[PDB]
């Protein structure tokens, strides 16, 4: 039966759905950890017992217990990316798309969901991998992964709660696909891992820890990357925000043992409810339990890794959109409203870039003030609105995945860069905000095929065409067609540094992506910052 | 007789002159100080003791002693700022152009030249004063100081070279001239100075001091401002320099006493020799012996006076060349040649700003460089020469007076400002140069008046329509005509920041000078050096 497959952790039954007026299969919520309950929480997972009988995969898992955005019930803009499932503990598993009939041997893509490593699901609309394993004829996965305290409590030193469990999480969904993907008629030697946000730094992550390189042959990274200054902390302060849950839910902090202890007995959202309080600072995008570097996943820091070339060599296709800091801004800048144009004061202006540069002295503050600021019309409200946009996307996505970009491009073996500038049709969100944070994801799931979502003609064409550009570079290493007529995405290099716009205008080449903001947030201000 | 007039220190007799086929006459070479000659050498002046019988003032007084440019030989372009009058230390005189007939009482117009404080003459053909007198029919003097270390070497404490004694040679001057214009047809109550660069310093300082503030009515500055960067120094840099110059000429060094006798028995030309080695940095438009802060001539700081308003309260009308600094790059910076585009490599522009700003650390040096690098076209050779003309420019002399005037119109009566950027036609530097510093001269002098000049007809009527500017300002404190039809110089304020540009194009209003530029020079750069 095409639905039934024999893997190495027992037999699976999958389901056959509808995509486009055809059919595909689909095994969802398939386990590959044990649950990581009681005892286990905020331990590295571990594999799943095999079991006797037939796993039903007809329906989708639960999502893993995170915070819940409420901050507009009701609307869809904000509701599509909270979980669409029970919560649990129990919420290591896997979904598989795979296409009909069966393929013996093709590419297969992995994907990791972002959100902030504090939310996120494998099962959200968006996610829906049939449109494009059945339109590019992939076998696609989507894997789950613990987040927030749950998945990155970090407490060094002690093997209870030694940090990045959710990255292992990551890491043992992989080695199932790795190890059991070929009977479902993936090539386990051709995949490739995506991700968004977290995802695309988790994916980044990956490429780095030498405990993971092995188990997938390419990467893409949409919107983050391993450097991002939210997506790590120090042992230190990893162990300090630890600690700091624990005192916000009056445990006993002795020792690691009775802090962990104490944590285990809570209730789920015990501890998401406390989960914000531990920021060292007041800030906007900055998440409390994110990877740490210990050591071990990671061996040193980040940055010595990607001077010295150790990290896994491969090709890598990976671009930002052009609006990543609005999402931000709405949710925590003062000034910033859904519902209004939300033209910045000064004073407004001022107070967001304190909080989007937490770590910064009063002269970082200026810097960066004046790098952004028009000085010749100070108060347009549009420009103070738009220049902290810029500010929040160039400091926490843009510039740090540019800085990743140039370092990996010296050792790996081809680059592809996008800017993904094109506001959908029918989004839900205000003007302001432009190219939102997550917005490219639809077309590259390709929603805009559905003709009931209400997208255009050109955007149903864009979806295909960033589709065809993602598998094929899936399968090839390469997004571009062999002897295609279409226009050519040319490779990054170190020295030309060529990127393309993705949108539904006819391609168009570029040069340095926002270079002269990126020598600032790379070069010019943690000099300034390390010397004052 | 026309030509004969008695003052209060004697008779004194004139010459005509022809002027655009007319006359008027001149009184050249008038001693106002005893001659700072010998045991008087870097002393106060002193008044000129007066004379009996009839002082000849047919002929043009010596030029002080001063370096000389040999950098190009035979080079008008360079040559026609050298002395064209044998120097010496008996220099203090002054020349007054007085229409015919004799004006009873008209508008005085007093010029102080420019020339870093090291050198200058009252003598240049572009000080001819005889076209601005007599077409704007007002009486024009044009004063002298001594320059160098003869004006300027500074020992605070003693009151053998207490420094400053240049800006007192010109307020002695200032006081004949309130004494005894009166006789020459000059209204003593309403007299302007203007100058430029050191000059436009020297009538800042004016402004400012309050021994000289009652010595004239009105102020114009051309290209400098009392606030600019190589202006002044401070006691300490003062002594500093002249124990240094001492130290060249192998003096003793025991006591101030020991150090000046030594100075005063040593030739001119010998300390003219050793000038330029007592700078402290590799530098490039930074002068030797310039005013010092004292305590005296200066009560405090320029700032702290800037700031809380101690200084005369007038109108002013002030300005700056749209390339000032492209001079003083190609005499000091590697790359820069007369007789090439001068299109400068990374190599040589990271050479030339830390020329430029010579008293900033490496992080300033970075700063500098992030605001005027284009990092999407880094290699751009003209990019960079240009690039380093606007920082010396900046630096040097636009943002200083943009300070100096948005400070100044806080308690002012009234401010004119301008933006001059009309490249003469028959300028002999080349290209790369745009408008020169200094160029602005010719111009408010009338040159493009006479035929044999070369000057195109819109030249011409560029030159009436700045005379005209300058000669209503000095006579009304307004620059325009009561009633006229021409379009208005608008008013600087300090809300509206409004100024005019001075070509051959029709007005044009613009506002906020080099803002974003200005906002770096005086905000930014000078916290990021305090607080590094
Ligand atoms: C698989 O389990 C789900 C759980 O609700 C159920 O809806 C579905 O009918 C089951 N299918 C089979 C064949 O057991
Ligand atoms: C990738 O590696 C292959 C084999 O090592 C080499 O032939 C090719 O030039 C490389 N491509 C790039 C873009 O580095
Ligand atoms: C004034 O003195 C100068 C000095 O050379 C001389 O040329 C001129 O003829 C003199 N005129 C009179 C009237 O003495
Ligand atoms: C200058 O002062 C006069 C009298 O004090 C006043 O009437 C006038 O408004 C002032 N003008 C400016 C521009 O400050």
Same mark, same amino acid.
């Given at each position: 039966?095409?639905?039934?497959?024999?893997?190495?952790?027992?037999?699976?039954?999958?389901?056959?759905?509808?995509?486009?007026?055809? %059919?595909?299969?689909?095994?969802?919520?398939?386990?590959?950890?044990?649950?990581?309950?009681?005892?286990?929480?905020?331990?590295?997972?571990?594999?799943?017992?095999?079991?006797?009988?037939?796993?039903?995969?007809?329906?989708?898992?639960?999502?893993?217990?995170?915070?819940?955005?409420?901050?507009?019930?009701?609307?869809?803009?904000?509701? *599509?990316?909270?979980?669409?499932?029970?919560?649990?503990?129990?919420?290591?598993?896997?979904?598989?798309?795979?296409?009909?009939?069966?393929?013996?041997?093709?590419?297969?893509?992995?994907?990791?969901?972002?959100?902030?490593?504090?939310?996120?699901?494998?099962?959200?609309?968006?996610?829906?991998?049939?449109?494009?394993?059945?339109?590019?004829?992939?076998?696609?996965?989507?894997?789950?992964?613990?987040?927030?305290?749950?998945?990155?409590?970090?407490?060094?030193?002690?093997?209870?709660?030694?940090?990045?469990?959710?990255?292992?999480?990551?890491?043992?969904?992989?080695? +199932?696909?790795?190890?059991?993907?070929?009977?479902?008629?993936?090539?386990?030697?051709?995949?490739?891992?995506?991700?968004?946000?977290?995802?695309?730094? &988790?994916?980044?992550?990956?490429?780095?820890?030498?405990? &993971?390189?092995?188990?997938?042959?390419?990467?893409?990274?949409?919107?983050? &990357?391993?450097?991002?200054?939210?997506?790590?902390?120090?042992?230190?302060?990893?162990?300090?925000?630890?600690?700091?849950?624990?005192?916000?839910?009056?445990?006993?902090?002795?020792?690691?043992?009775?802090?962990? %202890?104490?944590?285990?007995?809570?209730?789920?959202?015990?501890? @998401?409810?406390?989960?914000?309080?531990?920021?060292?600072?007041?800030?906007?995008?900055?998440?409390?339990?994110?990877?740490?570097?210990?050591?071990?996943?990671?061996?040193?820091?980040?940055? =010595? *890794?990607?001077?010295?070339?150790?990290?896994?060599?491969?090709?890598?296709?990976?671009?930002?959109?052009?609006?990543?800091?609005?999402?931000?801004?709405?949710?925590?800048?003062?000034?910033?409203?859904?519902?209004?144009?939300?033209?910045?004061?000064? #004073?407004?202006?001022? =107070?967001?870039?304190?909080?989007?540069?937490?770590?910064?002295?009063? !002269?970082?503050?200026?810097?960066?003030? !004046?790098?952004?600021?028009?000085?010749?019309?100070?108060?347009?409200?549009?420009?103070?609105?738009?220049?902290?946009?810029?500010?929040?996307?160039?400091?926490?996505? @843009?510039?740090?995945?540019?800085?990743?970009?140039?370092?990996?491009?010296?050792?790996?073996?081809?680059?592809?860069?996008?800017?993904?500038?094109?506001?959908?049709?029918?989004?839900? +969100?205000?003007?302001?905000?432009?190219?939102?944070?997550?917005?490219?994801? #639809?077309?590259?799931?390709?929603?805009?095929?559905?003709?009931? !979502?209400?997208?255009?003609?050109?955007?149903?064409?864009?979806?295909?065409?960033?589709?065809?550009?993602?598998?094929?570079?899936?399968?090839?290493?390469?997004?571009?067609?062999?002897?295609?007529?279409?226009?050519? +995405?040319?490779?990054?290099?170190?020295?030309?540094?060529?990127?393309?716009?993705?949108?539904?205008?006819?391609?168009?080449? %570029?040069?340095?992506?926002?270079?002269?903001?990126?020598?600032?947030?790379?070069?010019?201000?943690?000099?300034?910052?390390?010397?004052?």
């Amino acid at each position: 039966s095409e639905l039934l497959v024999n893997t190495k952790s027992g037999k699976v039954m999958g389901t056959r759905v509808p995509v486009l007026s055809s %059919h595909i299969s689909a095994f969802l919520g398939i386990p590959f950890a044990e649950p990581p309950v009681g005892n286990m929480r905020f331990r590295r997972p571990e594999p799943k017992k095999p079991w006797s009988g037939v796993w039903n995969a007809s329906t989708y898992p639960n999502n893993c217990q995170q915070y819940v955005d409420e901050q507009f019930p009701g609307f869809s803009g904000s509701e *599509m990316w909270n979980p669409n499932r029970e919560m649990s503990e129990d919420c290591l598993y896997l979904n598989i798309w795979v296409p009909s009939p069966r393929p013996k041997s093709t590419t297969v893509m992995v994907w990791i969901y972002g959100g902030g490593f504090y939310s996120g699901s494998s099962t959200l609309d968006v996610y829906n991998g049939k449109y494009l394993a059945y339109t590019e004829e992939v076998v696609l996965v989507s894997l789950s992964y613990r987040v927030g305290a749950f998945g990155f409590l970090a407490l060094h030193g002690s093997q209870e709660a030694p940090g990045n469990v959710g990255l292992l999480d990551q890491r043992m969904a992989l080695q +199932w696909v790795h190890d059991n993907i070929q009977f479902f008629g993936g090539d386990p030697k051709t995949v490739t891992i995506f991700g968004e946000s977290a995802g695309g730094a &988790s994916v980044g992550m990956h490429i780095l820890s030498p405990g &993971s390189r092995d188990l997938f042959r390419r990467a893409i990274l949409q919107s983050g &990357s391993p450097n991002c200054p939210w997506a790590s902390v120090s042992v230190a302060e990893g162990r300090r925000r630890a600690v700091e849950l624990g005192r916000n839910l009056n445990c006993n902090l002795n020792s690691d043992e009775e802090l962990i %202890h104490c944590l285990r007995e809570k209730k789920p959202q015990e501890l @998401i409810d406390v989960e914000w309080n531990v920021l060292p600072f007041d800030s906007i995008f900055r998440f409390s339990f994110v990877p740490v570097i210990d050591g071990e996943f990671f061996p040193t820091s980040l940055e =010595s *890794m990607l001077n010295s070339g150790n990290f896994k060599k491969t090709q890598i296709l990976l671009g930002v959109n052009k609006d990543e800091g609005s999402f931000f801004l709405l949710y925590g800048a003062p000034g910033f409203s859904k519902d209004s144009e939300s033209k910045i004061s000064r #004073e407004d202006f001022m =107070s967001g870039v304190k909080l989007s540069v937490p770590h910064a002295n009063d !002269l970082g503050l200026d810097a960066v003030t !004046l790098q952004y600021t028009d000085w010749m019309d100070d108060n347009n409200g549009i420009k103070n609105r738009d220049g902290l946009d810029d500010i929040v996307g160039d400091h926490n996505v @843009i510039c740090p995945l540019m800085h990743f970009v140039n370092k990996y491009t010296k050792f790996g073996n081809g680059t592809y860069l996008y800017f993904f500038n094109h506001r959908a049709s029918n989004l839900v +969100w205000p003007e302001w905000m432009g190219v939102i944070h997550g917005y490219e994801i #639809e077309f590259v799931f390709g929603l805009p095929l559905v003709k009931e !979502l209400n997208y255009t003609a050109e955007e149903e064409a864009l979806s295909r065409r960033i589709m065809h550009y993602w598998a094929t570079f899936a399968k090839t290493g390469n997004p571009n067609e062999p002897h295609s007529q279409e226009s050519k +995405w040319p490779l990054f290099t170190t020295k030309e540094q060529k990127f393309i716009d993705l949108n539904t205008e006819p391609m168009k080449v %570029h040069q340095r992506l926002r270079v002269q903001m990126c020598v600032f947030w790379n070069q010019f201000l943690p000099k300034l910052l390390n010397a004052t």
